Point group: C2
């Protein structure tokens, strides 16, 4: 009932990249108000929008670029390039601005125009490709650019680069230390899969039998062997199995409908005051569905929240209103 | 150098309000590379967008609501209300959501519709007033509402509430601990003045000789005794001296032109990779101007960075494009005699 805000960090950071990581683990209470969710079961959300550019990909852009520089894969006179219309391009733009490397981001001229402006603010060169060509048209142009200029480009390659996965060994360490080794279940919505696999690798090194749950859109359930299809959960459901995915490390895969993800995210900001994005809505509903299983009474369940709702204001996320009491809303999410 | 990311917090937070404060203090390097800034002076920015809703006001919405609950000014049955179309409204909605109070936020129908959406998501009731009426219109409606419903509402009153200034005693302690007591100058762009006064009150207790600098728009230099005027530095330059402002605690006031504040913020994100907002461009430019004074050689200068540039994507902050190299840009920002 006493409320203590955070204490001083007692650190002076040398640049913005040193503020990446060490993201806070916060108890959910509002949305966990269910008779079937026992009071000893703990439901915690790891808020990756505390990163400097407000997303989990900050860790990925940083590690990919910093390791490439240390590796000699990225050297002076070269430039970074990466086809992406998401948070990865922002994170690559942030790392390139700090390290002093030009960043080329290719995306359909169609896409994330707010995100275009973010990327240009950082000094990125944007490579806007034909809208009706989607992301395949962006990847196509990157390839053409590499081929026409050998030696010039370092490709981030977020779905095939193990420096992605490896960045989440820190994410894992943070979950282990913050929970004092009590974590039982981790739930992660899957885009590149760097988070689910990197967290799993490192936690299973600490405790075999931590349960690792991947989340993906019901409308595009490729990890569960379904076909790529249209869905609305931004940041996840890439439509293929990333080359960095390692199925051995994932214990269960939970599909979540696009509309249910959005409705969960609406309930989390309303009842817990936590403004999470759409993929977080998916992860959290999967986590609540675990928290109501009898076998999981008293367990500690940690749910990754990759981004904040502010990056979704031009989407449909908040535009749909929800009927009912809190208990009605939660019952409709957990039922059928 | 070796670059190391942040360590685990080693804390499980009981709710999102416990993640407010303890924001990071970061060195500037890119934008400090100008021949008139010395190698020894340390220029640091305190990034208040690390708060859970990405601005300094998180501390203020929290402490206003918390202290009123502790005092008995806010009690079960009452609702919160505040005329604001800044970050304070968001910070009140977040505090209200966690404490379980209804929040009513008044603003012109035409102002910050991105922020309206943010507020509605938190469950706030929006009171949208005539656009042409402006801020005054919203305040007038708040006044009408409290007049007609005596006892129902708790007014945050951000410009006159000492719980605003008091929240920044924590900001000050963070500056003190993070610098190991070496802080010499604090630069804060002034909106409510909770930050510059609350920081000054607590730091001036720690050591003699910490210089406190307030920053306001050139075109509305009201702390300097000039007349109010139109300006484009969002979050500062209220046009009046706030009731919580205490001039005794401020050593110097630096006026900064709107377009200079924007250009600074553009340079900070491109050369330091730090995406700060408009008022941060103002504070940082003032802080660089201090760093070039010979009397300030080797000192530690701490500049408050109240918000992130992503909250500004629909303004002209990033539309205007600066030609020229880094050194031309910095040399043009420090130009004035």
């Amino acid at each position: 009932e006493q409320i203590s805000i955070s204490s001083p960090r007692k650190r002076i950071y040398h640049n913005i990249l040193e503020t990446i990581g060490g993201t806070p683990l916060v108890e959910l209470h509002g949305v966990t108000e269910h008779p079937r969710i026992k009071k000893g079961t703990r439901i915690l959300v790891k808020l990756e929008y505390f990163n400097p550019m407000s997303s989990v990909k900050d860790r990925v852009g940083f590690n990919i670029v910093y390791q490439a520089i240390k590796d000699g894969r990225l050297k002076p006179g070269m430039e970074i390039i990466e086809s992406t219309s998401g948070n990865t391009g922002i994170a690559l733009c942030q790392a390139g601005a700090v390290f002093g490397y030009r960043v080329n981001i290719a995306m359909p001229s169609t896409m994330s125009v707010e995100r275009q402006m973010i990327m240009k603010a950082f000094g990125a060169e944007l490579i806007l490709t034909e809208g009706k060509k989607g992301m395949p048209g962006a990847i196509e142009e990157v390839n053409k650019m590499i081929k026409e200029n050998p030696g010039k480009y370092f490709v981030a390659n977020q779905f095939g680069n193990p420096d992605n996965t490896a960045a989440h060994h820190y994410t894992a360490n943070e979950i282990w230390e913050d929970t004092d080794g009590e974590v039982d279940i981790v739930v992660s919505a899957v885009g590149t899969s760097g988070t689910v696999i990197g967290v799993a690798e490192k936690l299973k090194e600490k405790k075999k039998g931590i349960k690792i749950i991947a989340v993906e859109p019901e409308e595009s359930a490729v990890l569960e062997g379904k076909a790529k299809g249209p869905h609305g959960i931004q940041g996840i459901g890439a439509g293929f199995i990333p080359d960095i995915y390692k199925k051995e490390f994932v214990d269960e895969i939970i599909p979540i409908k696009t509309q249910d993800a959005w409705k969960m995210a609406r309930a989390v900001v309303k009842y817990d005051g936590i403004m999470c994005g759409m993929s977080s809505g998916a992860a959290i509903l999967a986590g609540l569905k675990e928290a109501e299983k009898p076998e999981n009474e008293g367990k500690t369940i940690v749910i990754i929240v990759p981004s904040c709702g502010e990056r979704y204001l031009s989407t449909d996320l908040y535009k749909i209103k929800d009927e009912g009491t809190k208990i009605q809303i939660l019952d409709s999410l957990l039922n059928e």
